[PDB]
Ligand binder design. Structure first.
Ligand SMILES: COc1cc2cc(n1)NCCCCc1cccc(c1)C[C@@H]([C@H](O)CNCc1cccc(C(C)C)c1)NC2=O
Length: 377
């Protein structure tokens, strides 16, 4: 029955992927961002300039007030609101209805985006990072406890405006090719993983692998970019600059601020290297790698001019809170969040990115010694 969830995600580039949901009785329809990087289910519940619609608790006969406030600070944006519960469904999802916690967003700062088409966020990570504390059961935990939906979901995020699939409760084999390779979930709070090696165009970055996971590495469908710790970012940018030194780019391009453009269909993809991230595997001393093409980390953006020139932004930025494998990394891969077996699987997606001489890949097995030493403490 997973076919009913294929292509249930939509979005705008750089603005997250959302799924349609209903809350309350009678059902109120809202578009909800799917976020594996947090654990709160929250919806706009008061007028806002950028909200087309919002949750009206007064119109729901199943709404229950929890008489408790809540706020969530993300990297840049934040919101605050009122906790409560209500019945929730996913129209293009499993045929079930659950009573879930909902944060009714009453005030926000740089959270909603002008013209985004979504009105809320579904944090799919674990209770340990839920606000106000881990006693607020996340949506997916409520779904698994109250229904027979198996304890796993999978995400197929597709590039170019954009679409994808969130398969709730399983793996849809028509969404990927080749084999699924699994990496352990290190700890159940974020979807934390361990990166054991990094190569750019086949060249090992030759850093202490602890640097790749300082102070954690997570899989986060709610963050656009690949975010890298300071030392790793500097090494990666230095290598990417040298590989593409054929052309010159404004220094603001490398900061993710400015954009670069080329004549329609002349982007010099060949001068940009591939990035290989090696993840800890399931057996002793075994890893696997995922290979990232420049079509993933050069995010296409609309040019505000009359030009019909392909313009892009550098979708790799510096982090001070560890590695973030964001949406641009997940795109072109089918990613299985196998909560039941505490593992995350990667396979080449049915909507993979196309280069002419290169291809995104998930390859294994590799031998990697002392992988346990790569986790930060
Ligand atoms: C830095 O650049 C960033 C940051 C974020 C998003 C993006 N770009 N682009 C995508 C924007 C799409 C929509 C969006 C807006 C606001 C918040 C989020 C999406 C979720 C948040 C994730 O939840 C973050 N996950 C990790 C994290 C970080 C801090 C605190 C917590 C707590 C709440 C658990 C969790 N995304 C971002 O903050």
């Amino acid at each position: 029955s997973f076919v009913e969830m294929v292509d249930n995600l939509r979005g705008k580039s750089g603005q997250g992927y959302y799924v349609e949901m209903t809350v309350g009785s009678p059902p109120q329809t809202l578009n909800i961002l799917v976020d594996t990087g947090s654990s709160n289910f929250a919806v706009g519940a008061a007028p806002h300039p950028f909200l087309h619609r919002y949750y009206q608790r007064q119109l729901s006969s199943t709404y229950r007030d929890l008489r408790k406030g809540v706020y969530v600070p993300y990297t840049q944006g934040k919101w605050e609101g009122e906790l409560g519960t209500d019945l929730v469904s996913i129209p293009h999802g499993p045929n079930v209805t659950v009573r879930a916690n909902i944060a009714a967003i009453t005030e926000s700062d740089k959270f909603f985006i002008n013209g985004s088409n979504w009105e809320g966020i579904l944090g799919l990570a674990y209770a340990e990072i839920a606000r106000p504390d881990d006693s607020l059961e996340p949506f997916f935990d409520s779904l698994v406890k109250q229904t027979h939906v198996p304890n796993l979901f999978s995400l197929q995020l597709c590039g170019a405006s954009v679409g994808g699939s969130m398969i709730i409760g399983g793996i849809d084999h028509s969404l990927y090719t080749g084999s699924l390779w699994y990496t352990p979930i290190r700890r159940e709070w974020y979807y934390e993983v361990i990166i054991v090696r990094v190569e750019i165009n086949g060249q090992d970055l030759k850093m202490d692998c602890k640097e790749y996971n300082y102070d954690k590495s997570i899989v986060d469908s709610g963050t656009t970019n690949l975010r890298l710790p300071k030392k790793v970012f500097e090494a990666a940018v230095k290598s990417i600059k040298a590989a593409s030194s054929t052309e010159k780019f404004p220094d603001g391009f490398w900061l993710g601020e400015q954009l670069v453009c080329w004549q329609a269909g002349t982007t010099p993809w060949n001068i940009f290297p591939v990035i290989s991230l090696y993840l800890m595997g399931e057996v002793t001393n075994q890893s696997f790698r995922i290979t990232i093409l420049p079509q993933q980390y050069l995010r296409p953006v609309e040019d505000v001019a009359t030009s019909q020139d392909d313009c892009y932004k550098f979708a790799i930025s510096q982090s001070s809170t560890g590695t973030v494998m964001g949406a641009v990394i997940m795109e072109g891969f089918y990613v299985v969040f196998d909560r039941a077996r505490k593992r995350i699987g990667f396979a080449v997606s049915a909507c993979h990115v196309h280069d002419e001489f290169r291809t995104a890949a998930v390859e294994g097995p590799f031998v990697t010694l002392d992988m346990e030493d790569c986790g930060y403490n």
